[PDB]
Design an enzyme around this catalytic site. Structure first.
Site, PDB file in Angstrom:
ATOM      1  N   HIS A   1       0.843  -1.227   0.000  1.00 24.54           N
ATOM      2  CA  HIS A   1       0.000   0.000   0.000  1.00 24.54           C
ATOM      3  C   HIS A   1       0.868   1.263   0.000  1.00 24.54           C
ATOM      4  O   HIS A   1       0.676   2.151   0.860  1.00 24.54           O
ATOM      5  CB  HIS A   1      -0.990  -0.053   1.152  1.00 24.54           C
TER       6      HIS A   1
ATOM      7  N   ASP B   1      -5.113   5.671  -1.425  1.00 24.97           N
ATOM      8  CA  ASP B   1      -4.564   4.914  -0.268  1.00 24.97           C
ATOM      9  C   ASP B   1      -3.623   5.834   0.537  1.00 24.97           C
ATOM     10  O   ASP B   1      -2.791   5.311   1.296  1.00 24.97           O
ATOM     11  CB  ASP B   1      -3.910   3.606  -0.724  1.00 24.97           C
TER      12      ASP B   1
HETATM   13 MG   LIG Z   1      -7.389   1.047   0.190  1.00 21.79          MG
HETATM   14 ZN   LIG Z   2      -5.523   0.412  -3.087  1.00 25.00          ZN
END
Ligand SMILES: [Mg+2]
Ligand SMILES: [Zn+2]
Ligand SMILES: CCOc1cc(CSc2nc3ccc4ncsc4c3[nH]2)ncc1C
EC number: 3.1.4.17
Length: 313
Positions: A68, A107
């Site tokens: 991420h 994110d």
């Molecule tokens: Mg996410």
């Molecule tokens: Zn993502």
């Protein structure tokens, strides 16, 4: 204004394909994103001075987690770029502006832990945002970076167009909450089949944009097998860390996050392709026929995992 970003020939060609990998040269990723904004939106959509300063603040606010991270952000933005490029006429100028920024920002400040883990930990973010915890955080962070002096890439939109773009980005980021995907796709499945799907209906556009966001977000499964296989290492590297932290709270993690159950990965991937990935790209292919290459790539990777289980690799 006359300053285009150009890419080397191999990238200039491959970047147009759904299965493009952005490569291991981090310092090229901003240029790739700006290139995609220019071809998808126009060389005019954003003051370059302000877009570059936005890109680098966004990058700064992604952490050094296995998956991420800033690479994921640009990867997800590229998948959206390919969807928008293969569906030229279906999306407004505002939507094309918003959705690439939404994917880059989706994110922001991820810690490498699921909503579940924040709630069991009793993280402060779980008190501020009861559902879609990280996704509301991600949008919060996007708004904060947009409000830094010199970072407002939307300055030259009207008051109403500015509220519309922020609202597109908000729904798009909340949609990346996979818990919401299942209902959103079932609803889209009913609407397509009973024939009531209407892209001039805003509530319908919202659902269709939500599905695109899920499809871009999971696009790891739509690459060539070696990229898909190597990304899974990073995906599982976060899941197993979270599993470790569950055990530290005296909770048995689910097998997906228990590093002691590495052997069940091939079978866990089958269920994931069958339960999430294939249905996602199937409903997207029905609504947006030109996105079929993603369904084909996903079915190819499903088949490669079937081969792994059968001991052939
Ligand atoms: Mg996410
Ligand atoms: Zn993502
Ligand atoms: C949004 C989640 O995205 C993902 C998630 C995954 C992991 S899916 C997955 N589901 C399960 C269930 C049981 C299990 N036992 C050992 S590994 C394992 C699993 N992995 N792979 C790829 C992608 C893109």
């Amino acid at each position: 204004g006359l300053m285009q970003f150009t890419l080397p020939v191999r990238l200039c060609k491959e970047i147009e394909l759904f299965h493009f990998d952005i490569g291991p040269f981090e310092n090229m990723w901003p240029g790739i994103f700006v290139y995609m904004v220019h071809r998808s939106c126009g060389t005019s959509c954003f003051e370059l001075e302000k877009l570059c300063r936005f890109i680098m603040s966004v990058k700064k606010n992604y952490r050094r987690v296995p998956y991420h991270n800033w690479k994921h952000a640009v990867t997800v933005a590229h998948c959206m770029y390919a969807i928008l490029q293969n569906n030229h006429t279906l999306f407004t100028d505002l939507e094309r502006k918003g959705l690439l920024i939404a994917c880059l920002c989706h994110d922001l400040d991820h810690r490498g832990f699921s909503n579940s883990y924040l709630q069991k930990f009793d993280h402060p973010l779980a008190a501020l945002y009861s559902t879609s915890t990280m996704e509301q955080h991600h949008f919060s962070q996007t708004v904060s970076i947009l409000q830094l002096e010199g970072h407002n890439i939307f300055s030259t939109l009207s008051s109403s167009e500015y509220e519309q773009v922020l609202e597109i980005i908000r729904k798009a980021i909340i949609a990346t909450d996979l818990a919401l995907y299942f209902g959103n796709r079932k609803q889209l499945e009913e609407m397509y089949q009973t024939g009531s799907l209407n892209l001039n209906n805003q509530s319908h556009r919202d659902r269709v944009i939500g599905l695109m966001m899920t499809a871009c977000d999971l696009c790891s499964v739509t690459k060539l097998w070696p990229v898909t296989k190597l990304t899974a290492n990073d995906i599982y590297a976060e899941f197993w860390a979270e599993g470790d932290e569950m055990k530290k709270l005296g909770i048995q993690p689910i097998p997906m996050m228990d590093r002691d159950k590495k052997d069940e990965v091939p079978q866990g991937q089958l269920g994931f392709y069958n339960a999430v990935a294939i249905p996602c790209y199937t409903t997207l292919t029905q609504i947006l026929p030109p996105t079929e290459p993603l369904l084909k790539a996903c079915r190819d990777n499903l088949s490669q995992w079937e081969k792994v289980i059968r001991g052939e690799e």
